[PDB]
Amino acid sequence: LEDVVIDRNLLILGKILGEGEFGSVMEGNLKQEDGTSLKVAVKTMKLDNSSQREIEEFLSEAACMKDFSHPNVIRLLGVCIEIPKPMVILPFMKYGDLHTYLLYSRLETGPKHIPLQTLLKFMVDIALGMEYLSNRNFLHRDLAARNCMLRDDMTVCVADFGLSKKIYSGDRIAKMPVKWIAIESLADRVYTSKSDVWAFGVTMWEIATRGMTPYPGVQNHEMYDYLLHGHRLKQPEDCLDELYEIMYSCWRTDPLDRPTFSVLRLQLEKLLESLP
């Protein structure tokens, strides 16, 4: 019930880390039951109305995510209701998203050059997190490197995921940009765990290229026709053939032909095991 709700008095909101359509993300402090405070990320949201049905739906979503348990899945510590202003509390991650971390590594003052072993371990972590969610039949619908967060121990965790299990007709579906959206999802208002697998392949590619924008030289508006002619992301210069084969398998036309996250995870783990 209200075991997801944290008393607002236990929260201190700090500097705004970033803003968007959904609202703002702030750095904060959460006083725990044990009397000690913890650094957190607070995401301010907008409820459609001052409705009990609206507020109950927010709490049911929060309780669902709060019950998730995986080291490669971002944890929800709880929610606050400050007109009612809903807020989501997550443990703060100083390293931020994987995408900016990859670009920073290409600069001196930024993290040291990430070796291939570390890049593959970033993928394995995402695959592990995706395996968890998709075994519970949860659909992500926003998988990209920009929505993957780095923990202090450098393990990657999946964030910004949906809490639905099936996509209903079309009355959007994939929240991520066109270049991460599966061919079937571009063609129809359709989305499965296999469409999430397509995004995983695109994310693996962003990781292997260290933050490069997918499909260089191809416009967003020409993506569906580009893929429809059988064109896929090209192999990076600094990329093992075995790794390229794994990511290419994520983009097979028929979603049924693409591997499940559990298949992918083992493929990647075996590749990592074979390297020094």
Ligand SMILES: Cc1c(C(=O)Nc2ccc(Oc3ccnc4[nH]cc(-c5ccccc5)c34)c(F)c2)c(=O)n(-c2ccc(F)cc2)n1C
């Ligand atoms: C999976 C998921 C959400 C999710 O993952 N949210 C999320 C992810 C990352 C966030 O951000 C962080 C978290 C930890 N360390 C960080 N370090 C830097 C950032 C940062 C700063 C600025 C811009 C972007 C990131 C940062 C954040 F606030 C929220 C989410 O909100 N919902 C959600 C919706 C409704 C509901 F009732 C219950 C949950 N669900 C389902």
